[PDB]
Design a protein around this ligand. Structure first.
Ligand SMILES: Nc1ncnc2c1ncn2[C@@H]1O[C@H](COP(=O)(O)OP(=O)(O)OP(=O)(O)O)[C@@H](O)[C@H]1O
Ligand SMILES: [Mg+2]
Length: 272
């Protein structure tokens, strides 16, 4: 099958689209790799990157694909970056008949919207997520989506249903960076409306591209028919492993995204 992946491409950095590609390809997908933005390097640690504004390009891309009669099976949407691009993506996706749409609602972290994002971006995001089968906000994002003031540990019994209220029936809101004791992981509502959690032991440090890889792995697994719970279980273990690998490399450069070798190996093994 074919998966559309629409997110930022940084030439240097090993995150987002650059990490999605190997991952998804190895997971047996033909990837339609669509940059929403093109950068010299990611935005953390290399100084101001050189960036291409793709706002006038994506409409052309979509128009083209349309006339060419291309149809996508699955879609993963990551970092978009502008109100207009979200709008464009939203309508394009509406035209497709997707069996799977996963949207990582990139908006912020540590209680605040990322620089450049305002409440207009937030509203644009709320529109984009309306058809999503799964959304993967972090704790800050969840709050922003619902309009609840940020809480470091929000009440999952409250925020989860609130989020679900914005999604279609049967879709799922999964909060991704939930910390419980020495664990870090994902929380969501099961079919009976009960809060579930699946985590792995938190490792020291902070890494780039973790969210990106998590999203790719989740899309990929779901795309292949794995129920949500087992998907989340595996994704978390896989990320844990990737971060472990990363530490193991004893890197001198803390900017490069999470290592993928072990992850690719795991994917190949699952494949048989
Ligand atoms: N230090 C860590 N140790 C273990 N696992 C981690 C760690 N950091 C992240 N993870 C894993 O990766 C997932 C990604 O969560 P995270 O909160 O980092 O995504 P994110 O908000 O996009 O972060 P990033 O900002 O780097 O994308 C977590 O669910 C967990 O599975
Ligand atoms: Mg994230």
């Amino acid at each position: 099958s074919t998966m559309l992946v629409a997110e930022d491409l940084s030439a240097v950095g090993g995150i987002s689209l650059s990490s999605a590609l190997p991952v998804l390809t190895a997971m047996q997908y033909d990837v339609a790799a669509l940059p929403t933005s093109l950068l010299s390097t990611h935005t953390s640690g290399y100084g101001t990157p050189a960036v291409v504004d793709l706002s006038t390009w994506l409409p052309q891309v979509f128009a083209h694909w349309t006339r060419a009669q291309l149809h996508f099976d699955q879609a993963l949407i990551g970092y978009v970056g502008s109100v207009a691009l979200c709008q464009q993506i939203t309508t394009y996706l509406e035209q497709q008949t997707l069996s799977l749409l996963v949207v990582d609602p990139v908006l912020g972290d540590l209680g605040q919207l990322y620089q450049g994002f305002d409440q207009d971006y937030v509203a644009a995001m709320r529109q984009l997520i309306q058809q999503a089968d799964v959304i993967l906000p972090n704790t800050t994002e969840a709050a922003l989506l619902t309009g609840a003031p940020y809480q470091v540990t929000p009440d999952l019994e409250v925020i989860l249903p609130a989020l679900q209220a914005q999604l279609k029936t049967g879709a799922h809101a999964v909060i991704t960076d939930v910390q419980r004791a020495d664990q870090i992981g994902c929380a969501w509502l099961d079919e009976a409306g009960h809060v579930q959690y699946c985590g792995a032991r938190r490792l020291p440090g902070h890494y780039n591209g973790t969210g990106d890889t998590l999203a790719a792995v989740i899309a990929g697994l779901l795309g292949r028919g794995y129920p949500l719970a087992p998907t989340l279980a595996r994704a978390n273990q896989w990320l844990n492993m990737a971060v472990a690998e990363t530490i193991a490399q004893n890197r001198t450069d803390d900017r490069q995204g999470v290592a993928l070798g072990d992850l690719l190996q795991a994917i190949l093994a699952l494949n048989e």
